[PDB]
Amino acid sequence: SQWGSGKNLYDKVCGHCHKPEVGVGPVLEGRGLPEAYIKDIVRNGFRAMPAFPASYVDDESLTQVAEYLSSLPA
Amino acid sequence: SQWGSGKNLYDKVCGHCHKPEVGVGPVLEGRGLPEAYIKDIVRNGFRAMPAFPASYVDDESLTQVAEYLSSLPA
Amino acid sequence: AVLPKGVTQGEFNKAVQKFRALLGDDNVLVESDQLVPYNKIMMPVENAAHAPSAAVTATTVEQVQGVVKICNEHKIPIWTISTGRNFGYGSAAPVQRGQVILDLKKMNKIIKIDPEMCYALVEPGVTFGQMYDYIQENNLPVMLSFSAPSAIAGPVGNTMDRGVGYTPYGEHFMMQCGMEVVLANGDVYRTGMGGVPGSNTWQIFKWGYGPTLDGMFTQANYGICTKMGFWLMPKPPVFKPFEVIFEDEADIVEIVDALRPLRMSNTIPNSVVIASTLWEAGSAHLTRAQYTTEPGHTPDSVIKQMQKDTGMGAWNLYAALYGTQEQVDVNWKIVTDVFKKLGKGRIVTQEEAGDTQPFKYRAQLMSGVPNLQEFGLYNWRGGGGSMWFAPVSEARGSECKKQAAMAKRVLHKYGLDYVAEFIVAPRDMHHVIDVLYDRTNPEETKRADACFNELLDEFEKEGYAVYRVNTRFQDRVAQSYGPVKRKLEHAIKRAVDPNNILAPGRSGIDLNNDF
Amino acid sequence: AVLPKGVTQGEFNKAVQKFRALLGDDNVLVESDQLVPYNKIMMPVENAAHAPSAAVTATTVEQVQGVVKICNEHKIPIWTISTGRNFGYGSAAPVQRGQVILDLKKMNKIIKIDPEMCYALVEPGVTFGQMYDYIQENNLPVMLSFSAPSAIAGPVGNTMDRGVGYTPYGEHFMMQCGMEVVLANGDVYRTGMGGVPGSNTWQIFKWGYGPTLDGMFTQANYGICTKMGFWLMPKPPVFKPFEVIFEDEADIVEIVDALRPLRMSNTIPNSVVIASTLWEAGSAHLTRAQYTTEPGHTPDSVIKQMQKDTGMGAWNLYAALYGTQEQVDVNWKIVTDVFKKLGKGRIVTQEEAGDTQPFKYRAQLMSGVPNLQEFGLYNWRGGGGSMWFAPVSEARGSECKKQAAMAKRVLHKYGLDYVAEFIVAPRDMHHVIDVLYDRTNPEETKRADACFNELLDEFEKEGYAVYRVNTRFQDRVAQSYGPVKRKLEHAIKRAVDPNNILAPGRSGIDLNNDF
Ligand SMILES: *Cc1cc2c(cc1C)nc1c(=O)[nH]c(=O)nc-1n2C[C@@H](O)[C@@H](O)[C@@H](O)COP(=O)(O)OP(=O)(O)OC[C@H]1O[C@@H](n2cnc3c(N)ncnc32)[C@H](O)[C@@H]1O
Ligand SMILES: *Cc1cc2c(cc1C)nc1c(=O)[nH]c(=O)nc-1n2C[C@@H](O)[C@@H](O)[C@@H](O)COP(=O)(O)OP(=O)(O)OC[C@H]1O[C@@H](n2cnc3c(N)ncnc32)[C@H](O)[C@@H]1O
Ligand code: HEC
Ligand code: HEC
Ligand SMILES: Cc1ccc(O)cc1
Ligand SMILES: Cc1ccc(O)cc1
Ligand SMILES: [Cl-]
Ligand SMILES: [Cl-]
Secondary structure (H helix, E strand, O other): OOOOOHHHHHHHHHHHHHOOOOOOOOOOOOOOOOHHHHHHHHHHOOOOOOOOOOOOOOHHHHHHHHHHHHOOOO | OOOOOHHHHHHHHHHHHHOOOOOOOOOOOOOOOOHHHHHHHHHHOOOOOOOOOOOOOOHHHHHHHHHHHHOOOO | OOOOOOOOHHHHHHHHHHHHHHHOOOOEEOOHHHHHHHHOOOOOOOHHHHOOOEEEEOOOHHHHHHHHHHHHHOOOOEEEEOOOOEOOOOEOOOOOOOOEEEEOOOOOOEEEEEOOOOEEEEOOOOOHHHHHHHHHHOOOOEEOOOOOOHHHOOHHHHHHOOOEOOOOOOEOOOOEEEEEEEOOOOOEEEOOOOOOOOOOOOOOOOOOOOOOOHHHHOOOOOOEEEEEEEEOEEOOOEEEEEEEEEOOHHHHHHHHHHHHHHHHOOOOOOOEEEEEHHHHHHHOOOOOOOOOOOOOOOOHHHHHHHHHHHOOOOEEEEEEEEEOHHHHHHHHHHHHHHHHHHOOOEEEEOOOOOOOOOHHHHHHHOOOOOOOHHHHHHHOOOOOEEEEEOEEEEOOHHHHHHHHHHHHHHHHHOOOOOOEEEEEOOOEEEEEEEEEEOOOOHHHHHHHHHHHHHHHHHHHHOOOOEOOOOHHHHHHHHHHHOHHHHHHHHHHHHHHOOOOOEOOOHHHOOOOOOO | OOOOOOOOHHHHHHHHHHHHHHHOOOOEEOOHHHHHHHHOOOOOOOHHHHOOOEEEEOOOHHHHHHHHHHHHHOOOOEEEEOOOOEOOOOEOOOOOOOOEEEEOOOOOOEEEEEOOOOEEEEOOOOOHHHHHHHHHHOOOOEEOOOOOOHHHOOHHHHHHOOOEOOOOOOEOOOOEEEEEEEOOOOOEEEOOOOOOOOOOOOOOOOOOOOOOOHHHHOOOOOOEEEEEEEEOEEOOOEEEEEEEEEOOHHHHHHHHHHHHHHHHOOOOOOOEEEEEHHHHHHHOOOOHHHOOOOOOOOOHHHHHHHHHHHOOOOEEEEEEEEEOHHHHHHHHHHHHHHHHHHOOOEEEEHHHHOOOOOHHHHHHHOOOOOOOHHHHHHHOOOOOEEEEEOEEEEOOHHHHHHHHHHHHHHHHHOOOOOOEEEEEOOOEEEEEEEEEEOOOOHHHHHHHHHHHHHHHHHHHHOOOOEOOOOOOOHHHHHHHHOHHHHHHHHHHHHHHOOOOOEOOOHHHOOOOOOO
């Protein structure tokens, strides 16, 4: 796809703020967050968090990252 | 005046090309060159030599440099 | 619902119909759920004031030329964005309500990276992260210079707004070389050596012949940049980062005055950052709530407490040495002696700090390694409200102290903090102040807006103006630079964009003004 | 006798009457014996083709504003000169016959030289010699950068034409900061931070806010520069000049490729000169007549003989190290090893050359000490005929070799010599070729004109163009950069000078053209 896999989207964009060692944003790894919720936060943005348009991160890539995050240990 | 003295015009402009150690132009020191001739070369320029307008080197300053050049030893 | 200023629902519909025919249906966005991510702003005003009417995504120069032809026909105003990560400066949202966003993120092609001549030619949608990957994969001996949002931001967008980096190639627009611009009439203009057919010097020699126009397009609405070239620093054999921690707030005068001869002589060749205690705190991910819950600004007593518990100073300077081992060793001996002779500040190196923050990220930023660590500044108070007040000053200590005190006073008046840093060049300082507030609290946003106005009024009175500002204050700042300048800018605007379609209002340039 | 193009004897007389009333009688020059020194050109055309109709000397900004108001009334075209020492580029004479010369030599005020912040703000008539005297008298720790005519030339004129120097601040327009321009409507515009009232940052921060227009005025006819600011290099404790003499003509490829990493890393921080044997000869004051009287070019056999008798090489490189003793010593060890590893070229220092020419003048030029030694180039063949063919190339060895061969061939075809030098920046070369000929010989001038045309045709075909050119070829070179560029330049010209009074024809910008 646009990012190939969800692991790739997480490593190149999301993880720069969300990885445990960073801590700009809360840990999303193994939290079982719904795909529909992740899609809402990325498209609307949440307070301190910026919003990313489809041209940057598409719907298909959001599905992949939601799935990748659920599969990891907490 | 504009250059103060003829020694000053020679040091700041003419001598950069005409002094013996330089040799871009021929030696003018103690050659008894006429004021009317020096006035003609500076205003018209001579081949490789550039011309200087009155705004750069005025008539009064040319008179002073002609007089300074005649007074020096060859 | 939302339409462009002066354009009727009918004319807009013919335009959207032509956009679709030219670009395809998935490249034209008119539904409000698709437009929502472009609307997110950190400015003290509601989203409605900067909401777009549509968003089109072009991928080729032929398409940008197309979008501009359609825009001239139906008098449609376009707002161009590249990577659109301009947080604290308007983000991805237009200067004015209802403008169409020409989103060029999909134009993400790296055209050339020459490892011998050390230059890069890229498209608008290229991110610094995308470039870092290409440089790592292909083992190229080049180094990047970038803004703190690094990985998510890009070269074209940051340089159009004349942004700043932290390596010796820090003043980004100084290192720019050659650009392709699509003008309002559809023509494709190439600056410098680009107009010459079969030229191999576009990214080599800056000026060209005749007037050199690269600067004319930056922070302006005279064309849409489609290709941009810049110079890359070659990877030095050794990189030596360091920090110098200072205890008193009044130490700023001596730090700046002692640092100046070292910057001017190029001993310390990079853009030096002198960060305040609160900026330093925010970047190390410390929140205000874990120190005080009291309303208004953070008192001097809790800042002094913050310094004891963590080891931060009132001013924390981060610099870096580049070169061969022998070059770095003699420069280290020069820098060390200057600080010893001062009898102030603790020197901390990579060995005694290494893996700890904020040293780690600053060292990464000064060597072209991406991280988004500095986004912790938005966690200091939270709420998602942030604006950059960035006045310009002389790299003279008394001036830095004067500006610091002026800012601190007006900010405290509105119950906000002085979270700032000085980015140092040989002769100038980019005094960057982050006016942080809670955007979900309507009373605090109303205060923040007033605070920003007063900050501009107070600084203009003392002869200071900002180098870049948010979309909401772009016209206001244009006033700081006098009427003759605005008059000249509108004359050029009438000449290159008679129909007023290229981002009206950008830097206060709009044909609907009386100039 | 000589009147402006399109202006009648009557309208011109009303203009001269108004000039006199505004400036005084001794500031308006209409007599041919007063106009004669402005007419001297080294171009292959008669004086008549570039003869002025009048010359006015202004001393204040109010007067320049006055001259422009009168010029707009009677449609009088003005040609502005500062120090007017543009030899080989049109000198002090106008692009077109009959233009009035606005001679600003009398505006020779040094407004400010800040020794701490290291900058200068000057008026057009200030010469580099005048600045050197002020710096010597007041013991200021600053260093100047200048073109070879140094003492007689000035900062404003050279930078308006984007000239080059030899110190680390060599690319003059890169170091420019802030300018005041009188527009065609009479308005006084100040770039960067100048528009802000009570600003102390005009010569500190380059850009300002909104479009940055300094570049737009250089090599253009969009305004008359009345004040210009620039940065000065602080005097380093030790200066170490050197030369590296190379034997073969084919050595150029390895010299350039070996020099590049040293320029890019800033080990050698100054504009390096790689001078050809004939350029070197001319500067050491050797004439052609003392070696051969045979017609046509100087044969390879007599050039090889010239090398044995004097010790010059095919390529003579002059560079310089700046900094502290320890900084210079480690950089000298790096430079020395690069040349030893090559196994080519003799290294000559200040100790083993010292008082001998051409080493002496180059060392002076690289340290901001004035001399007019390089004018010996006009003595190589004499006659007072000289034109600069200066193409731009990549600082890549194969490209330099290619350009050298192309030039040499076309020059020999017209019986002229290849007397050239490469001025090196990290990524670009200013390949400066002096097409020298005897102007008193009518057959050789006709050949020189044809040679210059063919030089431009040959280079454009291979994708190369010049960075600066003489008044006679300014329109020709404008063509090398394509139609879109010219179109944009005429659009801006109509907007800022509707009456076409500011130097029409400069850089090929004239409203009488179809663009
Ligand atoms: C939040 C934050 C912001 C920072 C920062 C740290 C934090 C925590 N650190 C920065 C730094 O060190 N240096 C900077 O210069 N900026 C910093 N910023 C702000 C930062 O977000 C921006 O500098 C920068 O990266 C902007 O992002 P961007 O690169 O995505 O640029 P953009 O696409 O938003 O474009 C900016 C601006 O440029 C104009 N425009 C864009 N593209 C074009 C084209 N093609 N043609 C014509 N004009 C163009 C437009 O007005 C746009 O808004
Ligand atoms: C003969 C020779 C010439 C050289 C040289 C060596 C020799 C032997 N070495 C040079 C060098 O290293 N680097 C250079 O850049 N040039 C060299 N030159 C040529 C040299 O004469 C010129 O570079 C330079 O010094 C020109 O003289 P100048 O400084 O007196 O400038 P100018 O007054 O003639 O102005 C040049 C050009 O600029 C435009 N113009 C001037 N002033 C203004 C203002 N105020 N406003 C608007 N336009 C202005 C105008 O087109 C003018 O012709
Ligand atoms: C730094 C610039 C970020 C990037 C890149 C991404 N996110 Fe983020 N995210 C960030 C912050 C500071 C916050 C907290 C905001 C607040 O004020 O509370 C968040 C939050 C989220 C959440 C909500 C988590 C929760 O526990 O409720 C989600 C689901 C989320 N972020 C997702 C997400 C994805 C999928 C990203 C890559 C496309 C991504 N974020 C990037 C900061 C940053
Ligand atoms: C270098 C750019 C020069 C400066 C500055 C001045 N002069 Fe010059 N001058 C120069 C040359 C190269 C020549 C020889 C020209 C040729 O082709 O022969 C000259 C010559 C003269 C002469 C003629 C001497 C003779 O032997 O007949 C005169 C009288 C003269 N120059 C005067 C002069 C004055 C007064 C100057 C300062 C205002 C001056 N020159 C400057 C080169 C240069
Ligand atoms: C860190 C930073 C620097 C500049 C700027 O304008 C904003 C933020
Ligand atoms: C020495 C020199 C350099 C550049 C130029 O254009 C002319 C002459
Ligand atoms: Cl914002
Ligand atoms: Cl000439």
